[PDB]
Structures are given as C-alpha cells and as structure tokens.
UniProtKB/Swiss-Prot annotation, chain A:
Assembly and interaction partners: Homodimer. Heterodimer with MAPRE3. Interacts with DCTN1, DCTN2, TERF1 and dynein intermediate chain. Interaction with DIAPH1 and DIAPH2. Interacts (via C-terminal residues 206-211) with APC (via C-terminal residues 2674-2843); the interaction inhibits association with and bundling of F-actin. Interacts with CLASP2, DST, KIF2C and STIM1; probably required for their targeting to the growing microtubule plus ends. Interacts with MTUS2; interaction is direct and probably targets MTUS2 to microtubules.
Source organism phylogeny: Eukaryota, Metazoa, Chordata, Craniata, Vertebrata
Family statement: Belongs to the MAPRE family.
Residues with PTM N6-acetyllysine: K32
Entry protein name: Microtubule-associated protein RP/EB family member 1
Organism of provenance: Homo sapiens
Superkingdom in the source lineage: Eukaryota
Length: 62, 69
C-alpha cells in the first residue's frame, strides 16, 4: 500500500510540474501573438496582411 | 487497495489529458509565431520599423530582453 502511494504521488507531482511549465509556455506564446495582433491593428501593408492571415488562420468569421 | 489505485489512476489520467490539450495549444501558438518569424526574416532587408517591433516581440525573453537570431 505505502509503496503504491509513493509511486503514484511522485508521478502526479511530476505531471503537475510539467503542466505548470507547459501552461506558462502557452501563456508566454499567446502574449506574443496578442502584442503582435495589437501592432497589426495600430498600423492597419502586404507584409502585415500576411501576418494577419497567420494570426487568424483558423478563423471562419467575416 | 483497488480503490486507492482507482483514485490515483483517474487522477493521472486526468493530468495526462490536460497535458495533451495544453501541448496542442502551445504548438498551435508556436506554429503561428514561427510562421511570423519567417515572414519577418524574408523582409528584414528593408529595416521596416513595424516589422522590427514584431521581431522584438518574437525574440523577447520573459524578462523583457531581446535575443536576436
């Protein structure tokens, strides 16, 4: 019983550390895209339009 | 205990679903930024101030320092 709890709690602790690092990385990249999205809206250029297409590549609106 | 393993298996199974969902989100965002970086690299010979601002966002660390590539 004690050995099983020891193994699973160590596995859970490892998964939760990887989850925290992955979500931190996800929010880090999402912040970059939103700041780039802000720059494209301020300067609303054929180069910027290609960047806008990437930002909303999977957007079905409009 | 069979009810102890079930308590920990379903918890690990829950965390692995969260990991798979987060990794898909990160790769989605990182793929966009990588495509944006390549567009800026193809047009860097003009020293466009707007594109340089975008590059400085791509290459900024979490402390705010820009590491060029």
């Amino acid at each position: 019983k004690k050995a099983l709890i020891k193994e699973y709690t160590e596995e859970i602790e490892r998964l939760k550390r990887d989850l925290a690092a992955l979500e931190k990385e996800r929010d880090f990249y999402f912040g970059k895209l939103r700041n780039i999205e802000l720059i494209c809206q301020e300067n609303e250029d054929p180069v910027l339009q290609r960047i806008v297409d990437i930002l909303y590549a999977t957007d079905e609106g409009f």
